[PDB]
Amino acid sequence: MLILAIISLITFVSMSKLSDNRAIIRLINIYLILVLVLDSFLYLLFLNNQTYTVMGELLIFNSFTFYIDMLIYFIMIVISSLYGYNLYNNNLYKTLFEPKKELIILFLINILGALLIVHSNDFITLFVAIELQSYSIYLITAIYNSSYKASKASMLYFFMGGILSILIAYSINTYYSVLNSYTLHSLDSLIINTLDLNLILIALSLGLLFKIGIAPLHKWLISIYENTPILITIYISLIPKISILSYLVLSNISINSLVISILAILTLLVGSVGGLLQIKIKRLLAFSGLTNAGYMMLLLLLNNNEFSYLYYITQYSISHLAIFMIIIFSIYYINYINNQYNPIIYVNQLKGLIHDNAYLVLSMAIVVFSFIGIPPLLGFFGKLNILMSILNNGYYFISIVLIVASLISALYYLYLLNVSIQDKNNILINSNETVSSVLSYILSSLIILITFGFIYNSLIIDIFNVYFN
């Protein structure tokens, strides 16, 4: 369905005028929804954890990959709604949020690259998919080329991602030079015992992991996140992280790695502490993303990680979308617009948001407490599953460091809510324009999922037991 949409969109957009942009996005939006609800039944193929090799063993399809594909579709639906629908109908919002002509095509191609990374069974598939996603993401970072910061960010992305792509390619070719193979399927317990692949496989892991920005190579990506337009930042800080992490979770090439243990510890410490002095909202959220990446990095040290990874990545994606949507919604109530690409920059600009929109601040409180991990919000159960996994496997010191990082990052999570519930002197009385019905419903659905999803926990585990065992 995705390839078809890309071909049709290139043709249609070529024959369309710049004023049709939003309409076109709306079309693709509904198309994606339809694919999600009419093609869902294919989950049945994976009953009892049946695995299928496809395309002459280039691709692998199982229940894990099918779930990740559904999640990526859902994320694309949510993010494309933010371009297809106006928050308000006034002139300022036309200036703030207008989709570029080719942006939707770049999004769909990037999604294709991500889904191909997830399903990669051979290293040539992995490299082609990785370069597809990387090139698309550079172009997505650059497409708002009136912005000085965005163009500079795109250059930085191109060069750092190119160096890391080279590291990945070199890893794959060393693996080939040792084994005369391009597939991890040729690895057996006997082969792992017989040969030292650790340096090759960790080089591959690090090449992949630095591309989503773990420590100590975190600042460049955080800079890119700060300096992109906000509706671009929502997309580019989530999709690559999901695709790369899902591939590493499914590949299991770093089990009980000392190097990955040390880098995960460093990532948790850097992400928690380095978020403390941040005053810009996007930098704060980027450090939050770094800390949650460290949480998920811990699951690369053990087998049977699928339930805890899938739970964590799902609830994290939901929370990330919710917090960015809340920040976008709050733009209407701020006094000072910093620029047209990042209308809101500083956390302090949210001061007194409760007096302008109380239920927006309730949504913020729910999301922030989920990030902290208060039960019965989804974030608590994500962290609980991760702790169960790591303590079952003997990672005691890392569990203590996880607790400490959670406590530390709670401070900068609470910063948002703290300023948001203080008093402001001039508060809103009335306004004739209402924010869009569609986007408000989407945000509310995300909030409700975060709040009440725990009710389905045991049902979810029951289904998981029959599709993943």
Partner 1 sequence: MFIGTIILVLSFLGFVFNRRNIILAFICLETMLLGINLILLRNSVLFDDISGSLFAIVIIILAGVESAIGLSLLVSYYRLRGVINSYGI
Partner 2 sequence: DILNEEAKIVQALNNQRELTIKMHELKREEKDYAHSYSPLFSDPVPQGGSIGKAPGSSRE
Partner 3 sequence: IAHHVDKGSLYRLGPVGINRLLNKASYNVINLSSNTRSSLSMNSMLILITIVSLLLLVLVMNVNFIIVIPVLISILYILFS
Ligand X SMILES: CCCCC/C=C/C/C=C\CCCCCCCC(=O)O[C@H](COC(=O)CCCCCCCCCCCCCCC)COP(=O)([O-])OCC[N+](C)(C)C
Ligand Y SMILES: CCCCC/C=C/C/C=C/C/C=C\C/C=C\CCCC(=O)O[C@H](COC(=O)CCCCCCCCCCCCCCCCC)COP(=O)(O)O[C@@H]1[C@H](O)[C@H](O)[C@@H](O)[C@H](O)[C@H]1O
Ligand Z SMILES: CCCCCCCCCCCCCCCCCC(=O)OC[C@H](COP(=O)([O-])OCC(O)COP(=O)([O-])OC[C@@H](COC(=O)CCCCCCCCCCCCCCCCC)OC(=O)CCCCCCCCCCCCCCCCC)OC(=O)CCCCCCCCCCCCCCCCC
Please report how close the Cβ of residue 41 comes to ligand X at its closest, in angstroms: 6
For residue 3, the partner it binds in partner 2, ligand Y, ligand Z, none, with Cβ less than 5 to 8 A by kind, is ligand Z
For residue 369, the partner it binds in partner 2, ligand Y, ligand 3PE, none, with Cβ less than 5 to 8 A by kind, is ligand 3PE
Measuring CA to CA, which residue among 327, 243, 315 is closest to residue 282?
A: 327
Nearer to ligand Y, 252 or 257 (CB): 257
Please report how close the Cβ of residue 460 comes to partner 2 at its closest, in angstroms: 14
Residues 1-40 that bind ligand Z (CB under 6 A): 3-4
Sketch the per residue contact string, 273 through 312, with ligand X: x for CB under 6 A, - otherwise.
Answer: ----------------------------------x--xx-
Q: How many CA atoms lie within 13 A of 327 on its CB side?
A: 25
Nearer to ligand Z, 7 or 199 (CB): 7
Query: Judged by CB under 6 A, does residue 377 bind ligand 3PE?
Result: yes
Measuring CA to CA, which residue among 382, 207, 407 is closest to residue 295?
A: 382
Read off the tokens for 427: 């508060």
Sketch the per residue contact string, 57 through 96, with ligand X: x for CB under 6 A, - otherwise.
Answer: ------x--xx--xx--x----------------------
Please report how close the Cβ of residue 429 comes to ligand 3PE at its closest, in angstroms: 13
Query: Judged by CB under 8 A, does residue 223 bind partner 3?
Result: yes
Please report how close the Cβ of residue 4 comes to ligand Z at its closest, in angstroms: 6
Please report how close the Cβ of residue 466 comes to partner 3 at its closest, in angstroms: 42
Read off the tokens for 148: 């000085």
Please report how close the Cβ of residue 369 comes to ligand 3PE at its closest, in angstroms: 4
For residue 411, the partner it binds in partner 3, partner 2, partner 1, none, with Cβ less than 5 to 8 A by kind, is partner 3
Measuring CA to CA, which residue among 251, 361, 340, 344 is closest to residue 300?
A: 251
Query: Judged by CB under 6 A, does residue 362 bind ligand 3PE?
Result: yes
Measuring CA to CA, which residue among 275, 256, 175, 167 is closest to residue 215?
A: 275
For residue 128, the partner it binds in ligand X, partner 1, ligand Z, none, with Cβ less than 5 to 8 A by kind, is partner 1
Which residues here bind ligand X, judged by CB under 6 A? Answer: 36-37, 40, 43, 63, 66-67, 70-71, 74, 307, 310-311, 314-315, 378, 449, 453, 456, 460, 463-464, 467
Which residues here bind partner 2, judged by CB under 8 A? Answer: 48-53, 57, 185, 304, 465, 468-469
Which residues here bind ligand Y, judged by CB under 6 A? Answer: 163, 166-167, 170, 198-199, 202-203, 206, 256-259, 437-438, 441-442, 445
